[PDB]
Structure formats: structure tokens, C-alpha cells
Design a protein around this motif. Structure first.
Motif, PDB file in Angstrom:
ATOM      1  N   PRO A 103      45.766  25.231   9.154  1.00 45.80           N
ATOM      2  CA  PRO A 103      45.626  25.956  10.337  1.00 45.80           C
ATOM      3  C   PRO A 103      46.669  27.135  10.449  1.00 45.80           C
ATOM      4  CG  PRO A 103      45.798  23.717  10.817  1.00 45.80           C
ATOM      5  CD  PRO A 103      45.951  23.812   9.255  1.00 45.80           C
ATOM      6  N   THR A 104      46.086  28.102  10.877  1.00 46.63           N
ATOM      7  CA  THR A 104      46.986  29.447  11.272  1.00 46.63           C
ATOM      8  C   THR A 104      48.052  29.037  12.183  1.00 46.63           C
ATOM      9  OG1 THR A 104      45.032  30.972  10.721  1.00 46.63           O
ATOM     10  CG2 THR A 104      46.928  31.799  12.158  1.00 46.63           C
ATOM     11  N   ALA A 105      47.611  28.440  13.156  1.00 47.54           N
ATOM     12  CA  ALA A 105      48.660  28.331  14.459  1.00 47.54           C
ATOM     13  C   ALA A 105      48.395  27.006  15.122  1.00 47.54           C
ATOM     14  CB  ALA A 105      48.386  29.467  15.194  1.00 47.54           C
ATOM     15  N   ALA A 106      48.608  25.806  14.307  1.00 50.24           N
ATOM     16  CA  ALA A 106      48.587  24.338  14.764  1.00 50.24           C
ATOM     17  C   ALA A 106      49.578  24.348  16.177  1.00 50.24           C
ATOM     18  CB  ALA A 106      48.692  23.565  13.968  1.00 50.24           C
ATOM     19  N   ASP A 107      50.888  24.995  15.732  1.00 48.65           N
ATOM     20  CA  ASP A 107      51.692  25.171  16.858  1.00 48.65           C
ATOM     21  C   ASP A 107      51.375  25.732  18.260  1.00 48.65           C
ATOM     22  OD1 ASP A 107      51.574  27.689  15.374  1.00 48.65           O
ATOM     23  OD2 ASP A 107      53.716  27.855  15.448  1.00 48.65           O
ATOM     24  N   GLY A 108      50.005  26.274  18.297  1.00 46.36           N
ATOM     25  CA  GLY A 108      49.938  26.927  19.388  1.00 46.36           C
ATOM     26  C   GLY A 108      49.879  28.418  19.799  1.00 46.36           C
ATOM     27  N   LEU A 109      49.230  28.890  20.814  1.00 45.87           N
ATOM     28  CA  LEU A 109      49.376  30.359  21.105  1.00 45.87           C
ATOM     29  C   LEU A 109      50.891  30.565  21.400  1.00 45.87           C
ATOM     30  CD1 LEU A 109      48.236  32.973  21.878  1.00 45.87           C
ATOM     31  CD2 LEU A 109      47.531  32.208  24.138  1.00 45.87           C
ATOM     32  N   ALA A 161      53.795  29.223  21.032  1.00 45.50           N
ATOM     33  CA  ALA A 161      54.585  29.237  19.908  1.00 45.50           C
ATOM     34  C   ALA A 161      54.677  30.418  18.918  1.00 45.50           C
ATOM     35  CB  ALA A 161      54.500  28.143  18.976  1.00 45.50           C
ATOM     36  N   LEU A 162      53.219  30.545  18.524  1.00 51.97           N
ATOM     37  CA  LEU A 162      52.883  32.008  17.950  1.00 51.97           C
ATOM     38  C   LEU A 162      53.520  33.266  18.808  1.00 51.97           C
ATOM     39  CD1 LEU A 162      51.364  33.540  15.779  1.00 51.97           C
ATOM     40  CD2 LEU A 162      49.285  33.445  17.238  1.00 51.97           C
ATOM     41  N   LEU A 163      53.292  33.291  19.801  1.00 49.21           N
ATOM     42  CA  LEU A 163      53.760  34.504  20.703  1.00 49.21           C
ATOM     43  C   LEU A 163      55.301  34.513  20.529  1.00 49.21           C
ATOM     44  CD1 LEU A 163      51.291  34.390  23.566  1.00 49.21           C
ATOM     45  CD2 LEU A 163      51.568  36.485  22.083  1.00 49.21           C
ATOM     46  N   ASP A 164      55.884  33.437  20.730  1.00 48.27           N
ATOM     47  CA  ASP A 164      57.610  33.487  20.146  1.00 48.27           C
ATOM     48  C   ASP A 164      58.056  33.512  18.947  1.00 48.27           C
ATOM     49  OD1 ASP A 164      57.459  33.206  23.369  1.00 48.27           O
ATOM     50  OD2 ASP A 164      57.521  31.223  23.150  1.00 48.27           O
ATOM     51  N   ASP A 165      57.021  33.388  18.061  1.00 46.59           N
ATOM     52  CA  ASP A 165      57.814  33.184  16.511  1.00 46.59           C
ATOM     53  C   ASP A 165      57.972  34.659  16.045  1.00 46.59           C
ATOM     54  OD1 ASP A 165      58.016  32.799  14.027  1.00 46.59           O
ATOM     55  OD2 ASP A 165      55.989  31.791  13.506  1.00 46.59           O
ATOM     56  N   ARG A 166      59.244  35.009  16.039  1.00 42.20           N
ATOM     57  CA  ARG A 166      59.470  36.377  15.529  1.00 42.20           C
ATOM     58  C   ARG A 166      59.290  36.435  14.172  1.00 42.20           C
ATOM     59  NH1 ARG A 166      62.671  39.738  18.496  1.00 42.20           N
ATOM     60  NH2 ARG A 166      63.726  40.579  16.556  1.00 42.20           N
ATOM     61  N   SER A 167      59.081  35.427  13.386  1.00 47.22           N
ATOM     62  CA  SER A 167      58.668  35.548  11.830  1.00 47.22           C
ATOM     63  C   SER A 167      57.254  36.045  11.524  1.00 47.22           C
ATOM     64  CB  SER A 167      58.884  34.362  11.020  1.00 47.22           C
ATOM     65  OG  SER A 167      58.061  33.179  11.135  1.00 47.22           O
ATOM     66  N   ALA A 168      56.340  35.864  12.772  1.00 46.29           N
ATOM     67  CA  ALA A 168      55.212  36.310  12.528  1.00 46.29           C
ATOM     68  C   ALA A 168      54.921  37.890  12.837  1.00 46.29           C
ATOM     69  CB  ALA A 168      54.097  35.535  13.715  1.00 46.29           C
ATOM     70  N   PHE A 169      55.871  38.586  13.368  1.00 45.22           N
ATOM     71  CA  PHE A 169      55.753  39.933  13.929  1.00 45.22           C
ATOM     72  C   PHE A 169      56.934  40.642  13.744  1.00 45.22           C
ATOM     73  CE2 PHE A 169      55.094  43.632  16.589  1.00 45.22           C
ATOM     74  CZ  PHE A 169      53.942  44.213  16.131  1.00 45.22           C
ATOM     75  N   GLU A 170      57.782  40.524  14.620  1.00 45.58           N
ATOM     76  CA  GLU A 170      59.159  41.421  14.603  1.00 45.58           C
ATOM     77  C   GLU A 170      60.054  41.318  13.396  1.00 45.58           C
ATOM     78  OE1 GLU A 170      58.092  39.083  17.072  1.00 45.58           O
ATOM     79  OE2 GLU A 170      58.063  40.001  19.036  1.00 45.58           O
ATOM     80  N   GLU A 171      60.084  40.250  12.786  1.00 49.55           N
ATOM     81  CA  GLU A 171      61.064  40.060  11.560  1.00 49.55           C
ATOM     82  C   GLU A 171      59.911  39.842  10.161  1.00 49.55           C
ATOM     83  OE1 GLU A 171      63.897  37.151  12.577  1.00 49.55           O
ATOM     84  OE2 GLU A 171      64.246  38.436  14.440  1.00 49.55           O
ATOM     85  N   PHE A 172      58.568  39.871  10.292  1.00 44.16           N
ATOM     86  CA  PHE A 172      57.690  39.848   9.231  1.00 44.16           C
ATOM     87  C   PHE A 172      57.896  40.899   8.354  1.00 44.16           C
ATOM     88  CE2 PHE A 172      53.334  40.141   7.500  1.00 44.16           C
ATOM     89  CZ  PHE A 172      53.484  38.877   6.723  1.00 44.16           C
ATOM     90  N   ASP A 173      58.119  40.603   6.969  1.00 42.14           N
ATOM     91  CA  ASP A 173      58.403  41.435   6.036  1.00 42.14           C
ATOM     92  C   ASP A 173      56.810  41.829   5.192  1.00 42.14           C
ATOM     93  OD1 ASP A 173      59.015  43.293   3.858  1.00 42.14           O
ATOM     94  OD2 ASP A 173      60.849  41.865   3.244  1.00 42.14           O
TER      95      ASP A 173
END
Ligand SMILES: [Mg+2]
Ligand SMILES: [Mg+2]
Ligand SMILES: [Mg+2]
Ligand SMILES: [Mg+2]
Ligand SMILES: [Mn+2]
Ligand SMILES: [Mn+2]
Ligand SMILES: [Mn+2]
Ligand SMILES: [Mn+2]
Lengths: 386, 386, 386, 386
Positions: A340-346, A348-360
Motif C-alpha cells: 500500500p502507498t498509504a496504509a497509514d491514511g490520508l 498521516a500522508l498529509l503530515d509526512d514531511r518525507s513525502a513532499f517537503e523533505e523528499f529528495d
């Protein structure tokens, strides 16, 4: 070597080995086969069963007594050989009355006749033990834009399939329907032209659980589509009720070559998928022995259908069992595709900085997918070069 | 003559008139257009609105302050011109990170990044008043069979669209999603390759009422399919949320010619259908002015999109209003196609001897459909030869 | 196992392994390769040589001194590795000046510039030992009917090739020309779209013996044509000067997959023909490692090109050497196809009553061709299932 | 309005209006037409003449006296109507004996029979005044790779056409041959599949001046090729001896729609070219009235062929006569395309510094081609919107 047995569930239509070789430009090159002889010859080759259109088995316009005679002869050959009949279908395309369609003919009285002719053969299919009833709407469509209002035609198509579903449920029959898509030929464009269009239409029927698809290798390839991809979508929707196996060389007239001819790598990936997914329906060949062949060529072509399936089954199994291939699949992150891409839920995905702000993104972009080494391992396996 | 006004609802993507003419074999032939200048030029031509990918409007990797600056400049041009923004979409295909897909990339961290990049632009689209959010999965697919397990990929595709639906409902946004199918290019095969596959996939989403299709003329024609037929099926399912208009010459690379080029009769039958069905969404042009053209050619090509729509609208209306055509439609029994096959019900059909036992199939077969005279009346109308 | 050596004459364009992965919808995924590094890497893999466009080797607009520097570096790598340069060609498609063509551009001054740019690189190719000079007219064509008068364009195309022939003969160069056909992409339609059109055009040149064809697997398949059939016609005319090997999945954008991917049975029949006919030119790969791959994937893809050729060579040789296949070929009368129809002459044929008046057409019609058993022997050989 | 007269040189095959509607999936929907009735009906519609296969006019296997009777009846209808017979051809595809070809059948005795059957009908065509004798090699080809060695088959094809040329020259006949290409159907691939392949083959015949091409709209479009481009190449080579006009919707089975259906803009550009080039041969329709139609539909479809030609002729003439179009053609430098690139010669080109050293490529690149404004003027003319 590679010898079929009835547990491989290989089936053939009566119209396949019995095709006389009439094409749009040429007369028949072979005599008609008696269905009884086809059943016996196919049983000797290792087939599991046969399929039929009503008009293959009972000549059009037969009296009720001739009809019983034809059925009884056929039943005796099935009993003598052990052959099954897992599928049947209706010829709604040969007779001139169907020149503008059966279920979607503009003339209402033809549509009613199409339904009555179908219902009669459903009764016969149930009596012969068929589990699946196929509908190929080969005349449903048009050569010109004004001839067919496609919304009205889809209304009429849904009306026809809903009545058939009401009929089988009211009789208590344990039979399901499978729509066989084809994009064109003999009509300039055919309604429900691909596996996708058919799957989408099924979802608007009154009782969608009764209906699935019967896709054909060559038909999806007549639209240039990837046939294993379409089958994977049908499996994903739980709708692969039956399948037609054959070969086709690209976008042209419907060739119906023996299975394994045409796009051979697509055949390999199809067998890999069917076997991995545990498809347990019939392996049905909707094919035409070319009209160059005599009767010995007909049976050689039929035998080749099953041989090519069994060779590809072995090579696909060897591919998936190879440790080096399993390592390559992980190298190409097929294991990650299954997670799953996001079993942690929407949230958690929105707060996950490694998914966007700090994604290399640049480090991620630099990762090769190693798909070419994987594909060459699949080539080596297909060719027996390892 | 044939002059568009904003009430015709013609819209254009920023990427269309702004295409610089980079193709796989050649460098850009035109300089970049500032979005503000496109908005003003399109407003002068009679356009109703514009559409954008996030990265058309905000250069990739812009700081949050540069981002506000770009949006404010854009907002001012919309206010100065009266132009609307009815649709927006996400670029999940240009950056190298998306080389194996966005929502169905094998790498999980890319999939999460794809979702975050999309959600950010949904917020921006709602703020600009967009009613429809388009998803074109141009990188979702494969060049080789082992690279993508299509069942797992469809799981990941459904996961991504379900999260987007949960996001818009949790925010209270009044926006709907439209999937834009394409069969191939830039991937060897793309997932959800036709309107039918997309419609079928939508029915497995958690909240199917949020999702429709955004079909494109040229994309269905890249599979050799009949585009008016596909649109009629989308209308029949209640799922035509948006449409992309352009031209394509058959089965080849995606040409994105101006609307009316390519298959002109298919354009005529498309406009006939959209107008007859009362489609009231945007008439959006997803097209590329050929790289032979300078900026004067860009605007001539844009103007031709709307001119050809308005000419075809007039000819289709004249066709349907012609008493001689209405008589021909009855001669070809289009009135009978619109009537229920069996409103009297299954049991009445089964007892109706005129539907089978006493049906004169030979008399019915002998009736001509008069489709050729009807089609030539449609040709005469298209050409203004009556 | 299946390891190439330089005597297999495998060659690669600099632009193939050096393709950075820019496609119409996406930025480059790989850095530029220095030609020197490509030469060394390809030599290690077993390649025999490399090919180039002028602009691959000398950056466009280089000064005369930079030009010498680039050539000298390149020459040193060829000397260090033993690599040859058997073919060269001109980039007349990337720069914006060529947006409407080189030799058939509507602007006369562009056509003259196209010729001067070509002549400069012919001198360089001769100095590097190239035997064949390829012309791919990728920009010669049109998106619309009025843009190009094709008779005038063919006049201009013949003018350009005649001048090139006059130039090489006046310099005493031992180089021949090969036209590489392609039906479409990047132009909507390209002039001389197939092997047949190119062969026909060559016969109208002033010195036809100087010109042959350089057909490409994927290009003929973009028109749905049989590539081994086209190559057999080129061989029959004595015009197969060079060949481009790669893979293509049907009628779509030019994929340039590694050789053996795409239509695998067509690859088998191509190798059978090239080896049987004693083609002794380079086995050149015009292919693009997919943009999913990093540099390790680039070299794996290059290696797979030659591996697949060598596997197919072995299987085709085994097929033709098999006594059972030789018996089947006689059963299918391939021996009779090779015999003259009427070496006895017209008058003997006209007087031969067994050719018409007493010919038993029904007995002749009844003979099966046994083509299916032959084709399954070819399948078994390809798969190593005998 | 748009009424044909015999001076428009419209011709029809007996097999066109006489097609009974047997397709691969369906029985005949219309009764057989007596050739005499077709001649009379076509004369009333304004046709100039008819064409025939031997077997259309004389039933296969007719006695010599039945043969004379059939010819005499036919001759009387031509005399009663003023109808001409400008073209004839041989049926070498319907009878089972031709299942592997006529001229390139593997069986030598079939090839000799094919030649005798052809020669007999050449005599008959000359007696009826035919100027062109067409050969459509519909059975020459293969479904599988090993069945046909294409070099040997091309040897046999050249042998057959050389004998026919020797026969007509020895008899003093004033008749020419025209090869009608088709890429596939009924064979999986047909030899000489396009106009280009046929033109190239002609150049290897003993007496090439006797042979030209008879291209068909739909056949080139079955390979996705541009039919006006192919015709321009045939005209450029001096080889357009005859032409088959009809309609086709893309890459699929051979539809043989009435002319103007299918790709309408391609029909416009074809008529523009034929009229501009002064083609003075027959305007022949090789078409099939769809099997939906009764006999009134057959004649409506035939009439529509000529109507659509005459409408397109008017619109193309109006286009070329329009001062605004003539200015646009100069704006797009079609005048410069018609001028020699280098009438000053090779040495002057090599010394001309404005062709390379001092050529401003950037200024030249910046010039737009104005092709879109030109193409929209052509659209407006086609639609009668100016
Ligand atoms: Mg089937
Ligand atoms: Mg689009
Ligand atoms: Mg090439
Ligand atoms: Mg024809
Ligand atoms: Mn089929
Ligand atoms: Mn597009
Ligand atoms: Mn290519
Ligand atoms: Mn045809």
C-alpha cells in the motif's frame, strides 16, 4: 513431450476445426465436418471439451424432430469420448435477418426474434451442462454515423441482457453470461469494442453478478491493445469468466491464427498471468485453421494450439521459479508495487514531511528501474537459453 | 462569420498554445509564452477560459513566495479579461522522478510524493474556481511485461483515487475528477487505455459518483476506435464530465492537431452528439500548433479550433432539422431503435408466437435499411451541398 | 554462452546508447555520454563498430578548431579499441531550421544549407573509413495537404541525391548511399514512407547504382508491414546496403526497443533470411534504452541486442539443418516455388493442354499445403522444444 | 445539382454493385445481378463504363458456347447504352485452386494454369476495347514465415508478368498492365503490399513501359499511408495508369465504402491532385454497397460515389482559384518548393558562402511556415464556409 490431457481443460468451438475456409474473397476449400467426427477427433488429441453455436449443431430452420435427432447423436459422441460442453453461444450474425444486429437491430421485431432464438439455446446449453453462455455481438454496430443512435442501442443492449438474466434466474439455471468484445468486423465499428467497454457496460445491468467477459487475444490486438493488461483488469474486477485463445498479427482483419502464432511474447505474458492468477476456467481456442490446409492440417493446427500453451506454461513457470529472476524482481521493486502507498491514511500522508517537503526528488529520479535486465531474463527463459 | 463568444464555453490549456515545439527529434521552435499573455490573447479570440497543469503556472521547485507571485499575476489577468478556469490538472509526467509513473510507480516513496503534489494543486484549483480536476496517467504503464504487475498497479491506482476522493470530501470541496485515457505514448502501453477501461475502473472506486472521464478525440483514435461511439457510452453512463477536442490522422503518435483536422466526419458526428445530448461542459482543446508555425500561426490554429466547431454545429443542426432527413431516419427505423424491445415483459415475449414460431424471417431479412441514402444526406449537409 | 565477437559485425549508433531519455512528455533521465566512453564501453561488450550523425560527434556550431579536437579524441578511441566506423549520417532534423525539412524544405536557402551540411560530413565519414552514408529524411513531409506539393518535393529530393552522387564521384570516394524509410513521426506523414517507396524512388536517380536502402525493423512495422518480406524485396533488387535492427510493438509511435523485443517471430524470420541470403553488411542497432534505465541498464540493453541476434541465429540454423524440416519444406512444395513456371517458353505454355484444357483444377485444389505443420516445426525450433 | 455525365469518365466494376453481401460471418443479403441489368442501371445513373473479372461475366467452367452467349448478351447491352469497357482483370482468388496464389502458388501446375486463365481473358478484354488490364494478386502471400520464400516468389511474379508482356507484344495488342497493391486480406501479408513496392517491382520487369499501378484509396489506408502522397509518387514516376476510388475508416479489414466516406479530407486532397495533374484515365469505383442495403440502396450508394467526386472537384477548384489561397501558398513558399535548389550546379553551391559559412540559420529558423492558416483556408473551402 508437451502432451495435453483433459485436466488441462483445453476446449474448441465446433466452428473452429469445422471452418470450411470461406473468406470474403474465396469459396470453401474443405468439406463440412460432422460435429460427431470433430468431437471424436478432438478427444483423441487430448481436448477436454467442445463449444457450439446453436446453428453449428442444429442446422438453421430444422424441424423439432430433426433437432432432437441432431442433439441425440451429439450426446452419444460426448458419452463415448468423455468430452464436456462447458460453453455455448448463439449465432446472431450469419442469417441475413441479422444484417443490422440481433439485440440492437433497428427493427423491433428482429430484436424480439433475436431474444427468442437465444433463450431457446440457453435451455439446450443447460441441458448439455454448459456453465457459461457467451454473447458475441458481431452485428451490433454500424458503418455510418446516422444509422445507429448509440445511446438508444445501449438501452436496447441492456434491455436484452436484463431479460436474459431474468430468464435464467426464473428458471433456476446455474449459468453465467460472458460478453465477447470485438472492435470491428463484420460491422464498421462494433458496440462494446474492447474488454474495458464491456466491463463498464456490465456495471449498469440489473444483476451484474451474472455477467463477465470472454476476451479474445486477437480482438484486443485488433485495437493495438495489450492483451495481458486487459486480462489483468478483467481479473482485477472478478470478471474473467472464460477466455478465447488464438493469434493475431497486429491491426488488420480478424485472423484467428492458432494460439502461439501472432504475438508470441504476448502469449508468454498471458500464460504467465493466467497460471499465476489461478484462472481455472476453460482454455478455449477460437481459431481458424488457414484455408491452405487439408484435414490433416486442421488437426495439426488444433494440436499446435495446445502444444504452444503447454510450452509457454513451462517457460513461464521456470521464469517465476528462477532465484535470479526473483532477485531481479526485487531489484525492480515489484515487491514495493504490491505494498500500500498509504496504509497509514490520508492525515498521516498529509503530515509526512518525507513525502513532499523533505523528499529528495533528484535521488529518487536517479534510481534505475533495471527493467531491461529483467526483460532479458524473461527472453532467455522464453527461448530456453538458460 | 462563425465567430466564437464566451457563451460557447471554448477553453484551452496553457500547454496548448504555449507548446514550444520540442518533439522527440527536435529542439524548440518557439519561445516560452508567459501565461498572462496567453490569457489575454485567448480572451481576444473569444475563448471562455483556460486550464493548467500545476507546473505550467508555477515553475517546478518554486519557493512558496515565488508561487504566490505567479498565482497573483495570473489572477489579475483572469480579472482583467473575464476568463474562467474550469479545469486543472497535475503534471505527473515531465520530471524524471515520474519515469515509472506517479500513482503506480514501483517505488512507494514516489507514489506518496505523486499524491502530495496532486493534493497541493487541488487546493489551488478550488481557489481558482475549477469545477473539474483531470488526471492523465501518462507514465502509468510499461514497456515490458515483467516490469508492472497490472493487478497490483490497479490496486495502487484505486488507492490513489480513493485518497483523493477522501481529501476533497473532507475539505468540503465541490470538485469532481475526470480520468483522461490514452492507450500508449510515452509508455509502451498505458493503464486504463480507453474510455471503456476508465469507465470500468471508476465503478470499483469507493465513491464512484465523484469520478468521470475526460476523453480526447485523438487518443481513442490511436486505438482505431470510434470516438462518437465512445462518447455516447460515456453519456449513457452519466460520466462525461469534460472533453478534449483535437484532431488525429489514424493510428500513429499522438498528433494533437487542431480540432476539425484529422477525421473530419468523426468531428461532425461528435458535434451532432454533444449538441443533441445537451452536453453543457467546457469545449476544451487539447491541441499543439505544429512546430512549423510562428506565433501568428499559433493563434490562427487556436482560432481554427473554434471556427471548425461552430461550422460543424451549424451543419449538424441543419441536418437534424431537415424534414427530408427526419423522413430518412424513419425510413431506417431509428424511431424503432428508441422503442423498448419488450416492454410487455419476459413472459409475454415467451408466449408471443409472432416473435419466433410465426416470425417471417425471410420477409424481415429482405427489408433494406436505407442507411446509404441517409449517410449521403449527412454528407450533403456537412459539405453544404443542400 | 552466446557471446558476441567483432566478427559478428554488430554496430551501434552513438545516439542509441547515448540517448538521454528526452521524449515528447519528459525531461532527460540520464546525463550525456562522451562519445569516447561509448566507444570503449561498446568495445568491451563485443561490438565491432559505431556510427554517428555529424552533430553527435561535433556539437552543432563548433569552430573549426573545436571540430578537429573532437575528431582527434574520437580517432584515438577507435585506435585504442579496434572499433570501426562503417556508417555515418547527417542530422537534418534536430535544429529548428529544419522544421519543414532539409532537402525538401519549402525555403530554397534551407535546402542549399542542408546539402552543404551533408557534404561536409561525407568528407568526414570517408576520412573515418565509412562505407555507407545513410539518409533519414525525418523532417521531409507534412502535417497538412496544402503545405507540400509532393511532386515538386520529389523533384527536390531527386535533385539533392543527384548532387550528392555527383559530389562523391567527382571526389573519387568509395562510399554508397542508403535511404532509411520511415512512414511518420516527427512529421504527420514522411516522404518515401516504406522500403518499397524508397526502392522505387532510387530507380529515378541519375546514378541508381550508388543508392540502396537502410530499412529499420520498427519503421516498416509502424505501417503494419511484414519486415522480412520487405527485406526480401530489397535483397531481390540488390539494394540492401545496410540494416537497422530493433523492436517495435505494432502500429504506434517509434519505440526503438532493443532487438528481439517487439515482434519476436518476425525477428526470427529476419535473422533466418539475412543468414540464408549471406547478408554481409553491418548488423546495426538503431535502438533507445528505455528512459526507466540508469547507465547499467543502458549497457544491459545493448548487450541484449546482440545476445538476441545470436540466439535467433542458432535457432534459425537449427531449423534449416533439421531433416524433418527439409522434408516438410518439400511437402509444402517450396522446392517447386524455386523452379521456373515456364522455362519452356510462352508458345509451349500456350500449346500445353495440361496447363488449361485438361488441367484437373479440383484435384489441384484438394492438395493441402501443409503450412501449419511446417510453422509449428519453426515454433518448436524457435522455443528450443526440439 | 452535381449530376454526372459520361464525359466525367466514371466507371464501376460488375462486382461492385453486384456484390451479394457475403462477408466472412454472413450469408448473401441480395440476389445476384445480371451483368446486363447492371450495365443498364449504371448507364442511367451517368456512368461512362464498366469493368469486369473474367468470372463476373462468364461463370467459372462455362462451355465455349455458353461463353459466346454470355459475351454476346453483354455486347448488346453495351451497344444499347453507349457504355464502354476500359478495364478488365482476372479472378485469380475465388476458386480453391488459388488458395496459395496464382502467379506465385507453390505448385508449379497452378502457376501455369493461372497464366493460361489470364491470357484467355486478355484476348477478351482487347476484343471489348479495354485499354488497361489490372492484376490484383490477392492470394499472393502467406500467413506464416516458412510457407513462402519471398525472393523465389518475386522471381515467379516477374516471370509471370514478363510472359504476359511478351504475349501482348507478340499479338500487337495496345493494352497496358496495372498492378493493384493491397497489404493484407485475404492473405496474412500480400506481396507488393503498397504502391511503392509495386512501383519498385515494375522497374525490374523486362519491358517496364508496359506496366503501371492501379492504387486503391482503402488499400493504402490499410497500411496507414497517405493516399494522395502515394498517388503523387505514382504520377511523378509516370505510372498512374488507372485508379480505384472508395472509402476506408483507418487500419482494419478492407471496407470498400463508397467514395467520399472514410477519410473525407484525404478524398479532397486526392481530387485536387488528380484534377491539377490532368489525370485523364477512368475514375473507377471499387466499392461494395453495405450488406444492410436492398437494391435501391445499391444504386443510391453508386450515385453517391459520383456525387461526392463532383462536389470535391468543385471545392478543390474553388480553393485553387481563390486569390487569398494563392497569396497564402506564396506565404508558405510553395512557389520556392517548385524552384531548383541548385540550378547553378555543384561547384557553384560549394563556393557559395551564403549557403553555409554566412548562412544565418537562426533567422531562417525563425520564419513561420504559415501552414495552419493555409490549411484552414482549405477547410473553409471544403465545407463551403467561404
Ligand atoms: Mg471468439
Ligand atoms: Mg488531453
Ligand atoms: Mg534507423
Ligand atoms: Mg481495387
Ligand atoms: Mn477472432
Ligand atoms: Mn493527445
Ligand atoms: Mn526508429
Ligand atoms: Mn478494397
Amino acid at each position: 513431450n508437451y502432451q495435453p490431457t483433459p485436466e488441462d481443460r483445453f476446449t474448441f468451438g465446433l466452428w473452429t476445426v469445422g471452418w470450411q475456409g470461406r473468406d470474403p474473397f474465396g469459396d470453401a476449400t474443405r468439406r463440412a465436418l460432422d460435429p460427431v467426427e470433430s468431437v471424436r477427433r478432438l478427444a483423441e488429441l487430448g481436448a477436454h471439451g467442445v463449444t457450439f453455436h446453436d446453428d453449428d449443431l442444429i442446422p438453421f430452420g430444422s424441424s423439432d424432430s430433426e433437432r432432437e435427432e441432431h442433439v441425440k447423436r451429439f450426446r452419444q459422441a460426448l458419452d463415448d469420448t468423455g468430452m464436456k460442453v462447458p460453453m455455448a453461444t448463439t449465432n446472431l450474425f450469419t442469417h441475413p435477418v441479422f444484417k443490422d444486429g440481433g439485440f440492437t437491430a433497428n427493427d423491433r421485431d428482429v430484436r424480439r426474434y433475436a431474444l427468442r432464438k437465444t433463450i431457446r439455446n440457453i435451455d439446450l446449453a443447460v441441458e448439455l451442462g454448459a456453465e457459461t453462455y457467451v454473447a458475441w455481438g458481431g452485428r451490433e454496430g454500424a458503418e455510418s454515423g446516422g444509422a445507429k443512435d448509440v445511446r438508444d442501442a445501449l438501452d436496447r443492449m441492456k434491455e436484452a441482457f436484463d431479460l436474459l438474466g431474468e430468464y435464467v434466474t426464473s428458471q433456476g439455471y446455474d449459468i453465467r453470461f460472458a460478453i465477447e468484445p470485438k472492435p470491428n468486423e463484420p460491422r464498421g465499428d462494433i458496440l462494446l469494442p474492447t474488454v474495458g467497454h464491456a466491463l463498464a457496460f456490465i456495471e449498469r445491468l440489473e444483476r451484474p453478478e451474472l455477467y463477465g467477459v470472454n476476451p479474445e487475444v486477437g480482438h484486443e490486438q485488433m485495437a493495438g491493445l495489450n492483451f495481458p493488461h486487459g486480462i489483468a483488469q478483467a481479473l482485477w474486477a472478478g470478471k474473467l469468466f472464460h477466455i478465447d485463445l488464438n493469434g493475431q498479427n497486429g491491426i488488420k482483419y480478424d485472423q484467428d491464427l492458432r494460439f502461439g502464432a501472432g504475438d508470441l511474447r504476448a502469449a508468454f505474458w498471458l500464460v504467465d498471468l493466467l497460471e499465476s492468477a489461478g484462472y481455472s476456467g476453460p482454455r478455449h481456442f477460437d481459431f481458424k485453421p488457414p484455408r491452405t490446409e487439408d484435414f490433416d492440417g486442421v488437426w495439426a493446427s488444433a494440436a499446435g494450439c495446445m502444444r504452444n500453451y503447454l510450452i509457454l506454461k513451462e517457460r513461464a513457470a521456470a521464469f517465476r521459479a528462477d532465484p535470479e529472476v526473483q532477485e531481479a524482481l526485487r531489484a525492480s521493486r515489484l515487491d514495493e508495487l504490491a505494498r500500500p502507498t498509504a496504509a497509514d491514511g490520508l492525515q498521516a500522508l498529509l503530515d509526512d514531511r518525507s513525502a513532499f517537503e523533505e523528499f529528495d526528488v533528484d535521488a529518487a529520479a536517479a534510481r534505475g528501474m533495471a527493467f531491461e535486465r529483467l526483460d532479458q531474463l524473461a527472453m532467455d527463459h522464453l527461448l530456453g537459453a538458460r
